[PDB]
Amino acid sequence: MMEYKIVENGLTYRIGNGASVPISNTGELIKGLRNYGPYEVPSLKYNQIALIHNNQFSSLINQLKSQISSKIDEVWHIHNINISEFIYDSPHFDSIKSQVDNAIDTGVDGIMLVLPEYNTPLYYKLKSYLINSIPSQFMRYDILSNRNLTFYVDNLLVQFVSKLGGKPWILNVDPEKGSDIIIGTGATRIDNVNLFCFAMVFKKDGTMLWNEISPIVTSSEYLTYLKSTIKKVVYGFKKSNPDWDVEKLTLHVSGKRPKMKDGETKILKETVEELKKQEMVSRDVKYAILHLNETHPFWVMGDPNNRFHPYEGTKVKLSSKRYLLTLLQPYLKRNGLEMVTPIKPLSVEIVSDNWTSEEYYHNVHEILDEIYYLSKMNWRGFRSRNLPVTVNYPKLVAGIIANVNRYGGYPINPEGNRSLQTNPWFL
Amino acid sequence: SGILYINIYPIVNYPETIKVSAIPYYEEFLPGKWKKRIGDLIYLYGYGIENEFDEIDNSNALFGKIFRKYLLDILSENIATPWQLKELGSTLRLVKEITENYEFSNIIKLQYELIINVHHWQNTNFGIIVDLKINILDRENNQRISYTKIKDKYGESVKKKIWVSVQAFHRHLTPEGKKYATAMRDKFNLLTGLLKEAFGSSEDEKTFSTPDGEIKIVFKPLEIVEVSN
RNA sequence: AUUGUACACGGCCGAAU
DNA sequence: ATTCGGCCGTGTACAAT
């Protein structure tokens, strides 16, 4: 006999120069992108992108290059540009790196390399090198051959324009009705070990911007790095804004689950106490720890008209810590709704909080409006990952970095390399 | 419309007070049947109340955390002929061999598995949860293998055979391989029907008999009200 | 690795005292 | 220590504009 509530219709995509792009409509989003450029057009010194591969005069690669030109020149507005081909002719990673060294020496700002096979070690070992220096996009030929290259290269180039330091899209989330500084978390389990990352959010321009990311942290240092990050986010927020933490200082934990006391919440409470003892955060500060989980024994029959699946916003429980939230509604195609397999909704649980139960119900939705607002923020394709960007992005960072370190590749870190911030590289 | 069937089947009726014989914890406490260890005690609810004869009310703190395993242990009794409970504990493992003339059935056997769970909210309402998980089993060997694990072995074209059959029985995809419309509705009609013919009650509700009172399950998904507040 | 959504396995990591 | 809830990896497929 629970009760579910829906976020009021909105969250229209903004891509700069004004926008009215809806959500869950890839056709409409790409139509807007062709009509209106991306949020921050990532023009660079060398208006020239290379495509590095092994094929020679293959019609498929030629069609790929023609599509890349006709789209990035018209849909992503990185103008005054041309696509150059580089050939390594030997699937060994050393030959490929030697070939991409030619593109680096030329100075091309974008490398859309094509691998021949599904080869994990070489893929990650070379992605480390070709991501810690230049925006790029490693892809492979086996899966390139099979499916249509329209729907393929569209998302390919969305990820590409995101990696070029620009922003494909931004969401219409108000400066109010949100958390000023969200420190999200994700994890990736390698050899039964959790590796954590934090997608710090600062509200750089009044709209929730993933401003800077953090490297992998083992669970042993998870709490200490969380304290350091609580301090760093308020430092950066004060530096970039003369405002105060009036609404919240929440978190977003996935891949783990925080404690009620003597753990994540105690660290957050103590560090917020330290911040308020130095006038940095307002007295009416809200800690609002959280926990996010994707797999669980729960499912939902949505309304039958919407392919029996729950709509884009639902909060089914009340007065309990756990809540459920639906994000992936079926895509609204020209004929109707996309036929979809049964989907598993995201479960939100407020592990600990200190709203003192006066307007607790208001602030539960105040967080939960944000996560549905913060989940379509991710820039990896025309499709969302049904996790907040503060959960998707740390997960991707941890996966990429753990894979790179497992194979002994070129080390990556977003702390030492200052240029990695506000420039998606981990996608 | 405006309702989200939440995979919960309500406990429409259950004893207002359940006779729970609280016992100080003892180090050799097996997980056992009809015994729950919440806090630092052992609560010999139901079968085994010969010590205290105690009664625990609805609003008591221990009631909510004892009646969960009480309900699991009383649901682990009345099960129909085909199904076979596998394991009991935090959840109940109800499996059932599949016989639906799926293509290449003589090589790999499919196995419905039911995940019996239970959720309590507001301390005055209850309900059981179900989740399905088909198990891939080679009928001649009865071991756990994956679609990639078969590959060319057991037939390369049979990957298109069990997988399509798996998503068809699971009601995610068509029996041929493509995708259909009412995947979500059939995803739970299957769960409700499977539980109904699993607990040996083709009727809407089964009135299980407990040492305390009578437990009745609506066997229907918990409707969620469209309250906005 | 265009993206997701699912899926089956393998291994499981952690909430509450 | 138990109860109880998840939880992310590697490979099949499916389909969007």
Residue numbers in the entry:
A (entry chain A): 1 to 427
B (entry chain B): 18 to 246
Verbatim from the authors:
Here we focus on the prokaryotic Argonaute AfAgo from Archaeoglobus fulgidus DSM4304. Although phylogenetically classified as a long-B pAgo, AfAgo contains only MID and catalytically inactive PIWI domains, akin to short pAgos. We show that AfAgo forms a heterodimeric complex with a protein encoded upstream in the same operon, which is a structural equivalent of the N-L1-L2 domains of long pAgos. This complex, structurally equivalent to a long PAZ-less pAgo, outperforms standalone AfAgo in guide RNA-mediated target DNA binding.
Next, we obtained cryo-EM structures of the fAfAgo complex with two variants of gRNA/tDNA heteroduplexes: g30/t51 (30 nt gRNA, 51 nt tDNA, final resolution 2.83 Å) and g17/t17 (17 nt gRNA, 17 nt gDNA, resolution 3.56 Å), and a 2.5 Å crystal structure of fAfAgo bound to a 15 nt 5′-phosphorylated ssDNA oligonucleotide. The nucleic acids resolved in the cryo-EM maps include a 25 bp protein-interacting fragment of gRNA/tDNA heteroduplex in the g30/t51 structure, and the full 17 bp gRNA/tDNA heteroduplex in the g17/t17 structure. fAfAgo proteins in these structures overlay with an RMSD value of ∼1.2 Å. Similarly to RsAgo, fAfAgo binds the gRNA/tDNA heteroduplex in the positively charged cleft, which is formed by both AfAgo and AfAgo-N subunits, forming multiple van der Waals and H-bond interactions to the RNA/DNA backbone. The AfAgo subunit, both standalone and AfAgo-N-bound, anchors the 5′–phosphorylated terminus of the guide strand in a conserved MID domain pocket, disrupts the g1:t1 (the first guide strand and the complementary target strand nucleotides) base pair by placing the g1 adenine and the t1 thymine bases into separated protein pockets, and makes similar contacts to the neighboring g2:t2 and g3:t3 base pairs. Taken together, structures presented here demonstrate that fAfAgo heterodimer preserves the g1:t1 base pair recognition mechanism previously demonstrated for the standalone AfAgo, but unlike the isolated AfAgo subunit, fAfAgo binds the guide/target heteroduplex in a specialized cleft in a similar manner as the structurally related long-B pAgos. Full AfAgo, like other long pAgos, forms a deep groove for interaction with the guide-target duplex that is absent in the standalone AfAgo.
